[PDB]
Design an enzyme around this catalytic site. Sequence first.
Site, PDB file in Angstrom:
ATOM      1  N   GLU A   1       0.838  -1.181   0.000  1.00 41.15           N
ATOM      2  CA  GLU A   1       0.000   0.000   0.000  1.00 41.15           C
ATOM      3  C   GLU A   1       0.884   1.247   0.000  1.00 41.15           C
ATOM      4  O   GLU A   1       1.979   1.245   0.579  1.00 41.15           O
ATOM      5  CB  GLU A   1      -0.883  -0.020   1.249  1.00 41.15           C
ATOM      6  CG  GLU A   1      -1.825   1.169   1.450  1.00 41.15           C
ATOM      7  CD  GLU A   1      -2.931   1.304   0.401  1.00 41.15           C
ATOM      8  OE1 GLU A   1      -3.613   0.328   0.103  1.00 41.15           O
ATOM      9  OE2 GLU A   1      -3.206   2.449  -0.038  1.00 41.15           O
TER      10      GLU A   1
ATOM     11  N   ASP B   1      -2.027  -5.394   0.806  1.00 44.67           N
ATOM     12  CA  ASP B   1      -1.376  -4.255   1.482  1.00 44.67           C
ATOM     13  C   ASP B   1       0.012  -4.547   1.991  1.00 44.67           C
ATOM     14  O   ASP B   1       0.857  -3.644   1.989  1.00 44.67           O
ATOM     15  CB  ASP B   1      -2.208  -3.820   2.660  1.00 44.67           C
ATOM     16  CG  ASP B   1      -3.481  -3.226   2.263  1.00 44.67           C
ATOM     17  OD1 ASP B   1      -3.447  -2.399   1.333  1.00 44.67           O
ATOM     18  OD2 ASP B   1      -4.525  -3.596   2.885  1.00 44.67           O
TER      19      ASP B   1
ATOM     20  N   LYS C   1     -14.521  -7.625   2.485  1.00 39.13           N
ATOM     21  CA  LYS C   1     -13.191  -7.889   1.965  1.00 39.13           C
ATOM     22  C   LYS C   1     -13.024  -9.286   1.441  1.00 39.13           C
ATOM     23  O   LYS C   1     -12.456  -9.490   0.367  1.00 39.13           O
ATOM     24  CB  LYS C   1     -12.133  -7.713   3.066  1.00 39.13           C
ATOM     25  CG  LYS C   1     -11.885  -6.290   3.428  1.00 39.13           C
ATOM     26  CD  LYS C   1     -11.206  -5.566   2.280  1.00 39.13           C
ATOM     27  CE  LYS C   1     -10.748  -4.202   2.741  1.00 39.13           C
ATOM     28  NZ  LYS C   1     -10.293  -3.381   1.606  1.00 39.13           N
TER      29      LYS C   1
END
Length: 199
Positions: A82, A110, A136
Amino acid sequence: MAMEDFVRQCFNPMIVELAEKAMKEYGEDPKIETNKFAAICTHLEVCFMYSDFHFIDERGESIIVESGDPNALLKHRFEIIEGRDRIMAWTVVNSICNTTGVEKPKFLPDLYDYKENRFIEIGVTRREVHIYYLEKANKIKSEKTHIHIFSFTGEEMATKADYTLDEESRARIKTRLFTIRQEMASRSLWDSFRQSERG
Ligand SMILES: O=c1ccn([C@@H]2O[C@H](COP(=O)(O)O)[C@@H](O)[C@H]2O)c(=O)[nH]1
Ligand SMILES: [Mn+2]
Ligand SMILES: [Mn+2]
Protein backbone atom coordinates in the site's frame (compact mmCIF):
# COMPACT_ATOMS: atom_id res chain seq x y z
CA MET A 1 -12.21 22.99 10.99
CA ALA A 2 -12.90 21.23 7.70
CA MET A 3 -11.91 17.56 7.43
CA GLU A 4 -9.25 18.55 4.89
CA ASP A 5 -7.62 20.82 7.50
CA PHE A 6 -7.84 18.19 10.22
CA VAL A 7 -6.07 15.62 8.01
CA ARG A 8 -3.11 17.96 7.52
CA GLN A 9 -2.81 18.69 11.28
CA CYS A 10 -3.37 15.09 12.38
CA PHE A 11 -1.12 13.11 10.00
CA ASN A 12 2.62 13.39 9.30
CA PRO A 13 3.18 15.35 6.05
CA MET A 14 4.89 12.34 4.40
CA ILE A 15 1.82 10.22 4.98
CA VAL A 16 -0.36 12.99 3.60
CA GLU A 17 1.78 13.19 0.44
CA LEU A 18 1.82 9.41 -0.10
CA ALA A 19 -1.95 9.37 0.50
CA GLU A 20 -2.52 12.26 -1.89
CA LYS A 21 -0.50 10.60 -4.66
CA ALA A 22 -2.44 7.31 -4.11
CA MET A 23 -5.80 9.11 -4.33
CA LYS A 24 -4.84 10.76 -7.53
CA GLU A 25 -3.61 7.49 -9.02
CA TYR A 26 -6.83 5.88 -7.62
CA GLY A 27 -8.78 8.65 -9.46
CA GLU A 28 -10.24 10.68 -6.56
CA ASP A 29 -9.92 14.33 -5.57
CA PRO A 30 -8.57 14.79 -2.00
CA LYS A 31 -9.97 18.31 -1.80
CA ILE A 32 -13.48 17.02 -2.58
CA GLU A 33 -13.54 13.50 -1.13
CA THR A 34 -12.28 14.65 2.23
CA ASN A 35 -13.56 11.70 4.29
CA LYS A 36 -12.00 9.26 1.83
CA PHE A 37 -8.74 11.26 2.16
CA ALA A 38 -8.78 10.90 5.95
CA ALA A 39 -9.55 7.18 5.59
CA ILE A 40 -6.68 6.61 3.09
CA CYS A 41 -4.25 8.47 5.38
CA THR A 42 -5.41 6.37 8.33
CA HIS A 43 -5.16 3.06 6.43
CA LEU A 44 -1.71 3.87 5.08
CA GLU A 45 -0.46 4.82 8.49
CA VAL A 46 -1.89 1.58 9.92
CA CYS A 47 -0.01 -0.35 7.17
CA PHE A 48 3.25 1.38 8.18
CA MET A 49 2.59 0.73 11.88
CA TYR A 50 1.93 -2.97 11.28
CA SER A 51 5.36 -3.32 9.76
CA ASP A 52 7.33 -1.08 12.17
CA PHE A 53 9.82 -2.87 14.43
CA HIS A 54 9.39 -6.38 13.00
CA PHE A 55 12.37 -7.98 11.35
CA ILE A 56 13.85 -11.22 10.08
CA ASP A 57 17.31 -11.89 11.57
CA GLU A 58 20.26 -13.50 9.71
CA ARG A 59 19.18 -16.86 11.24
CA GLY A 60 15.77 -16.50 9.50
CA GLU A 61 13.82 -15.88 12.73
CA SER A 62 11.18 -13.18 13.30
CA ILE A 63 12.23 -10.81 16.08
CA ILE A 64 11.16 -7.39 17.43
CA VAL A 65 13.47 -4.35 17.59
CA GLU A 66 12.16 -0.95 18.72
CA SER A 67 15.45 0.88 19.10
CA GLY A 68 15.90 2.72 15.78
CA ASP A 69 19.49 1.45 15.72
CA PRO A 70 21.85 2.99 13.11
CA ASN A 71 23.46 -0.47 12.77
CA ALA A 72 20.08 -2.30 12.73
CA LEU A 73 20.10 -2.95 8.99
CA LEU A 74 18.08 -6.17 8.86
CA LYS A 75 15.46 -7.45 6.44
CA HIS A 76 11.96 -6.31 7.37
CA ARG A 77 9.44 -9.01 8.31
CA PHE A 78 6.78 -7.25 6.28
CA GLU A 79 6.97 -5.66 2.89
CA ILE A 80 4.53 -2.82 2.35
CA ILE A 81 2.50 -2.75 -0.83
CA GLU A 82 0.00 0.00 0.00
CA GLY A 83 1.18 3.54 -0.82
CA ARG A 84 3.09 2.38 -3.88
CA ASP A 85 1.79 3.21 -7.29
CA ARG A 86 0.48 0.35 -9.35
CA ILE A 87 3.66 -0.13 -11.39
CA MET A 88 5.80 -0.34 -8.29
CA ALA A 89 3.24 -2.32 -6.28
CA TRP A 90 3.26 -5.09 -8.98
CA THR A 91 7.02 -4.95 -9.20
CA VAL A 92 7.19 -5.73 -5.51
CA VAL A 93 4.45 -8.39 -5.60
CA ASN A 94 6.29 -10.05 -8.52
CA SER A 95 9.61 -10.00 -6.62
CA ILE A 96 8.00 -11.43 -3.56
CA CYS A 97 6.40 -14.27 -5.54
CA ASN A 98 9.77 -15.06 -7.19
CA THR A 99 11.77 -14.93 -3.96
CA THR A 100 9.35 -17.00 -1.88
CA GLY A 101 7.30 -19.15 -4.21
CA VAL A 102 3.95 -18.01 -2.81
CA GLU A 103 0.89 -17.76 -5.02
CA LYS A 104 0.49 -14.45 -6.79
CA PRO A 105 -2.66 -12.57 -5.81
CA LYS A 106 -4.99 -11.24 -8.50
CA PHE A 107 -5.54 -8.06 -6.46
CA LEU A 108 -2.89 -5.91 -4.84
CA PRO A 109 -2.83 -6.68 -1.12
CA ASP A 110 -1.38 -4.25 1.48
CA LEU A 111 1.48 -6.23 3.05
CA TYR A 112 3.51 -9.44 2.67
CA ASP A 113 4.51 -11.35 5.80
CA TYR A 114 7.92 -13.03 5.30
CA LYS A 115 7.50 -15.21 8.43
CA GLU A 116 4.04 -16.52 7.72
CA ASN A 117 4.63 -16.37 3.95
CA ARG A 118 1.35 -14.79 3.03
CA PHE A 119 -0.10 -11.50 1.81
CA ILE A 120 -2.16 -9.42 4.13
CA GLU A 121 -5.11 -7.22 3.30
CA ILE A 122 -5.67 -4.56 5.94
CA GLY A 123 -9.03 -3.06 6.63
CA VAL A 124 -9.75 -0.02 8.79
CA THR A 125 -13.47 0.59 9.32
CA ARG A 126 -15.79 2.99 11.15
CA ARG A 127 -18.60 0.44 10.59
CA GLU A 128 -18.82 -3.04 12.14
CA VAL A 129 -15.74 -5.23 11.84
CA HIS A 130 -17.51 -8.49 10.89
CA ILE A 131 -19.38 -6.94 7.97
CA TYR A 132 -16.23 -5.21 6.74
CA TYR A 133 -14.35 -8.51 7.04
CA LEU A 134 -16.97 -10.27 4.90
CA GLU A 135 -16.94 -7.46 2.36
CA LYS A 136 -13.19 -7.89 1.96
CA ALA A 137 -13.31 -11.65 1.86
CA ASN A 138 -16.05 -11.45 -0.75
CA LYS A 139 -14.15 -8.92 -2.84
CA ILE A 140 -11.00 -11.11 -2.91
CA LYS A 141 -12.14 -14.72 -3.61
CA SER A 142 -8.34 -15.27 -3.27
CA GLU A 143 -8.55 -17.31 -0.02
CA LYS A 144 -4.74 -17.21 0.35
CA THR A 145 -4.64 -13.50 1.32
CA HIS A 146 -4.90 -13.08 5.09
CA ILE A 147 -7.42 -10.50 6.16
CA HIS A 148 -6.93 -8.32 9.27
CA ILE A 149 -9.59 -5.71 10.11
CA PHE A 150 -9.36 -2.87 12.67
CA SER A 151 -12.08 -0.53 13.81
CA PHE A 152 -11.68 2.81 15.46
CA THR A 153 -13.51 1.41 18.55
CA GLY A 154 -10.73 -1.12 19.09
CA GLU A 155 -12.43 -4.24 17.70
CA GLU A 156 -10.50 -6.50 15.37
CA MET A 157 -11.15 -9.54 13.25
CA ALA A 158 -8.65 -11.55 11.25
CA THR A 159 -8.69 -14.72 9.15
CA LYS A 160 -8.96 -17.80 11.41
CA ALA A 161 -8.68 -15.52 14.47
CA ASP A 162 -4.96 -15.28 13.69
CA TYR A 163 -3.95 -11.69 14.44
CA THR A 164 -0.38 -12.20 13.14
CA LEU A 165 1.23 -9.65 15.46
CA ASP A 166 1.80 -9.75 19.24
CA GLU A 167 -0.77 -8.00 21.42
CA GLU A 168 1.43 -4.97 22.05
CA SER A 169 1.87 -4.15 18.31
CA ARG A 170 -1.85 -4.34 17.77
CA ALA A 171 -2.48 -2.15 20.80
CA ARG A 172 -0.08 0.43 19.32
CA ILE A 173 -2.27 0.52 16.17
CA LYS A 174 -5.45 0.58 18.24
CA THR A 175 -4.09 3.49 20.27
CA ARG A 176 -3.42 5.53 17.18
CA LEU A 177 -6.99 4.81 15.92
CA PHE A 178 -8.41 5.71 19.39
CA THR A 179 -6.54 9.03 19.12
CA ILE A 180 -7.77 9.82 15.60
CA ARG A 181 -11.38 9.14 16.61
CA GLN A 182 -10.94 11.19 19.81
CA GLU A 183 -9.43 14.19 17.96
CA MET A 184 -12.10 14.07 15.22
CA ALA A 185 -14.83 14.09 17.92
CA SER A 186 -13.31 17.23 19.49
CA ARG A 187 -13.57 19.10 16.21
CA SER A 188 -17.00 17.64 15.55
CA LEU A 189 -15.81 15.70 12.48
CA TRP A 190 -16.36 12.18 13.71
CA ASP A 191 -20.09 11.93 13.00
CA SER A 192 -19.60 13.00 9.39
CA PHE A 193 -16.52 10.71 9.00
CA ARG A 194 -18.31 7.68 10.44
CA GLN A 195 -21.54 8.02 8.35
CA SER A 196 -19.52 8.69 5.20
CA GLU A 197 -18.01 5.19 4.96
CA ARG A 198 -19.59 3.03 2.25
CA GLY A 199 -19.20 -0.52 0.89
O1 LIG B 1 -9.18 2.20 -5.96
C1 LIG B 1 -9.16 2.41 -4.75
C2 LIG B 1 -8.54 1.59 -3.76
C3 LIG B 1 -8.58 1.95 -2.47
N1 LIG B 1 -9.23 3.09 -2.04
C4 LIG B 1 -9.25 3.45 -0.62
O2 LIG B 1 -7.96 3.20 -0.08
C5 LIG B 1 -8.08 2.68 1.28
C6 LIG B 1 -7.35 1.36 1.42
O3 LIG B 1 -7.89 0.37 0.53
P1 LIG B 1 -7.79 -1.20 0.84
O4 LIG B 1 -6.31 -1.48 0.79
O5 LIG B 1 -8.28 -1.60 2.17
O6 LIG B 1 -8.51 -1.70 -0.35
C7 LIG B 1 -9.57 2.65 1.58
O7 LIG B 1 -9.93 3.81 2.31
C8 LIG B 1 -10.21 2.58 0.20
O8 LIG B 1 -11.53 3.07 0.18
C9 LIG B 1 -9.86 3.94 -2.94
O9 LIG B 1 -10.42 4.96 -2.61
N2 LIG B 1 -9.78 3.54 -4.25
MN1 LIG C 1 -4.50 -1.62 -0.36
MN1 LIG D 1 -6.49 -2.49 2.79
